[PDB]
Amino acid sequence: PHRYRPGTVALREIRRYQKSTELLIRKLPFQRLVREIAQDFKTDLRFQSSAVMALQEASEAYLVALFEDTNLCAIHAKRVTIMPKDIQLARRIRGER
Amino acid sequence: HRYRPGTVALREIRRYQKSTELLIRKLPFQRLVREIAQDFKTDLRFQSSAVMALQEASEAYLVALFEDTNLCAIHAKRVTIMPKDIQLARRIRGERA
Amino acid sequence: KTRKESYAIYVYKVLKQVHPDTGISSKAMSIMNSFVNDVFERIAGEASRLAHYNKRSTITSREIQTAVRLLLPGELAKHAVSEGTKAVTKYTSA
Amino acid sequence: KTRKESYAIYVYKVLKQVHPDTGISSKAMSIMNSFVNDVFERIAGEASRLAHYNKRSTITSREIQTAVRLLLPGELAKHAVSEGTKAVTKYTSA
Amino acid sequence: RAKAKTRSSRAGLQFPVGRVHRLLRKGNYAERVGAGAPVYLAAVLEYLTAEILELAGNAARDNKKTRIIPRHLQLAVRNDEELNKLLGRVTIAQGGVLPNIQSVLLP
Amino acid sequence: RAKAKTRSSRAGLQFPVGRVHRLLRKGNYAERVGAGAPVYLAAVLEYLTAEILELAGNAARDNKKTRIIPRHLQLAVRNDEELNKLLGRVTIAQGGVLPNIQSVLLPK
Amino acid sequence: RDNIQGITKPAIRRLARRGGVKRISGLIYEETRGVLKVFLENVIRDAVTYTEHAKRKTVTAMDVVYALKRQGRTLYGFGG
Amino acid sequence: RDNIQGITKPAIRRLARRGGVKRISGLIYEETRGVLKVFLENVIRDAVTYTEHAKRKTVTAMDVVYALKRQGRTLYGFG
DNA sequence: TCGAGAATCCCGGTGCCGAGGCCGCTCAATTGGTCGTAGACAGCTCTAGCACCGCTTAAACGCACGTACGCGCTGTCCCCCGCGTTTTAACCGCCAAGGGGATTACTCCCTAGTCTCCAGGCACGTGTCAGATATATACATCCGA
DNA sequence: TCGGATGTATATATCTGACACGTGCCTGGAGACTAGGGAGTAATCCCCTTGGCGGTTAAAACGCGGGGGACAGCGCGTACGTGCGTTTAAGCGGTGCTAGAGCTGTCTACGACCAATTGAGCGGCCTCGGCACCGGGATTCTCGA
């Protein structure tokens, strides 16, 4: 029963997903979430496909950058695990809280 | 009589968070501004308002940076402020990033 | 001396509407003038971009209203839209 | 359809000048068009602000040069200023 | 001619509709400017001015002061959730900072 | 008349001086536009396009590809310090990120 | 209508992996969902404002591009 | 001229007390001087660019205000 | 809990300089008519967004184990704080000189505007060759052992 | 320190659809002028910026004792990573419909422009009272018993 140590597959995934450009969120759930959010601003709203694609690209870029900022806060406190406090500190220093 | 090593520091925190004065001496700051400006154009003149605006902006920037730095120090379970906290704040802000 | 216009007169009129006894200083008046100018340029630039996006040559009350909705946060936007609509309705009536 | 213009043939001409053997995709050309429009808008808006600050009603190559100096970083600004000055001199002489 | 009536009086405002119209027409914003745009913009600017001045006057009264100083303007803006959002990248000269000491720093 | 010569031919440019002039004149930037402003702006735009395209073509060559894709443009922009400063608040669609792992996370 | 749970835990783990994150806490996923909801709410509010101004029923890609540019998040490759 | 040393340790300590800092490391002053120097260099470079465009030898407060607004650091109270 | 002792605050006089009010006057906003085109409106058309529908199958979900890490506790010791003395130069009050910011007049050249026209660029149509997609092989790396 | 086994990179077919090229047309940029006003160039005025000096004293620099916080071990419990088996909707490809985005033609009403008129706002001038400053006592926080 071969088993990798905790962290080996994590670094493998880091390299694999930093080497590619694909979208990491499933498209249909994101489209449904976007339509659900937009329902509160206007009813019977229609969306171009490129509009939802642009929204997904922007959201994924924002989340990735926020995770890079969060990792620095985790490392600053002498940790390797990212915690919600690291996200909160990153968003506070950024100016988004 | 002798106050314990934290009392006077808290008193000064309360004192300088209650005032609006400029905390850097004006003549050294003006000399520094002229010295820096020497590298862009020779034989430059400055309005007093220009140096005053520069001092206000610089002091506001430094105070905000020290707030972010204090947050970073508290994140690392410290009460002392350190250069790595300044670097983390400037990296998350996007200045040294 | 040349004539330099500002918003000091109107800011003081509004101040006397709000606090009839409270006064203002020179630096606070400078800050208020800067605030009014900053918000004017923000809203006007947003409206200009809105007109350019839709291929129109005119900046109208619709453009200003949309710019106010885009820029001002939350309840500020709602109250400002109410104020602007009321003013335009009163102006058009008279 | 209607004619929608873009910097597609000019980016391709520049690409053929720089790397004569490679091509470009449609998404990369979309990104290049967006980049050209974004930088055009940045420089033009900076030059417009510069002309407004100095109370001039004309945008000239001096406004463009100063906008380039203010916007572009370091060596980018120097080389872009050199290229623009060369182009203007050649155009005026010709 | 008929006696002149300013557009601000017609709109019921104390901010200049005519000056704002001139600033819009000579600001390189659009080819044309509508007749209700200066009225709307003046109303919005006056509303924002009134909000800030009300909060700043409250701060001045709290500090037992008759006049508004930049400290009172800063106290008004930074203590309002929406005015702090609007003036987020804005520095007010001679305003200082809000009194705020972290809980871990206390004895 | 005479054989018409484009103003991008008199300036030795591959970018349109006439179209840039028209976009400046009809963009609500100033009341008037000078004759050398379109030439200067076209030269600057062409220089920036040429340098980013040179870096992107180098990136495409490193990956053994004959065509530039958004990943190559992102690699070119993020690997150049000045281009990264110029495009620091810009998101390139399908560009991915720059491969980077912190040293404390590496196995040792 | 509970569509925020369609942003699954594996998706957030992938987005963290592209961000260089090795270890993740179990409470990170709810925080990330809240952050994403806030971001999407702001951007979609701006885009729908742009759509309403144009007297349109369909939200176009240009509305999203302008909305993002308003927040200071310029996006290349979708028109502007 | 070492005029960056005119921004003294007590001045930086006062700036830290206004920012809420209770305890300060001994290496904080040189780092703060470096950060201040970089910030001032950026702002002064932009202000001087504005000054030379106007064909002036004097740097005005409006040049500083424009330079700060370019940096995303709008300042109220100087024009 | 309880007193020295120190720091901040809170009342009373001083006086002073900046905010608030007043007065010319000048230019910018108002009023009253044309003009022409920007946009409002009606109609057609024909993309493209939406709503099922069935099949793969890739990905999500749930669970079990254990191991690495987060977190609390303890001790060192040295570095930062508080305080006293000496030294330095910032600051404040004047004084003098002049460089350059700011304003005014004149005129010329440069930009807007119009008509003619024709060629550059855009939409379309088409084919072929980079590249995505299997597939087998060859290594690079990891984890006991 | 060597042997397995797992994951990823490389080299060879092989379709395919998207990119690069060619063609027709049309509309926007170039050529050739004309007209007028923006700005470039002198000149002048006087403001405010720079340089200098002296005395006070506020702040900075230095040093010294000590306490408390940064930091390095050390242990322990748990919660997150890895991997396997089950479930589920995502993705794909086709199908049909029609909502609305987009374009075109009319036409009208609204904003630009212009000329004359006058009053609102701006610069300059006082004046007094709100606040900065000075002094003394009450209040409170701190800290060693």
Numbering used by the authors:
A (entry chain E): 38 to 134
B (entry chain A): 39 to 135
C (entry chain H), D (entry chain D): 28 to 121
E (entry chain G): 11 to 117
F (entry chain C): 11 to 118
G (entry chain F): 23 to 102
H (entry chain B): 23 to 101
Sentences from the paper on this structure:
Here we show how myeloperoxidase (MPO), a highly expressed neutrophil protein, disassembles nucleosomes, thereby facilitating NET formation, yet also binds stably to NETs extracellularly. We describe how the oligomeric status of MPO governs both outcomes. MPO dimers interact with nucleosomal DNA using one protomer and concurrently dock into the nucleosome acidic patch with the other protomer. On the other hand, MPO monomers stably interact with the nucleosome acidic patch without making concomitant DNA contacts, explaining how monomeric MPO binds to and licences NETs to confer hypohalous acid production in the extracellular space.
All of the samples incubated for 2 min or longer contained a mixture of several molecular species, including free MPO dimers and free nucleosomes, as well as nucleosomes bound by MPO monomers and dimers, respectively. We acquired a dataset of such a sample that contained only two stable molecular species, free nucleosomes and MPO monomer–nucleosome complexes.
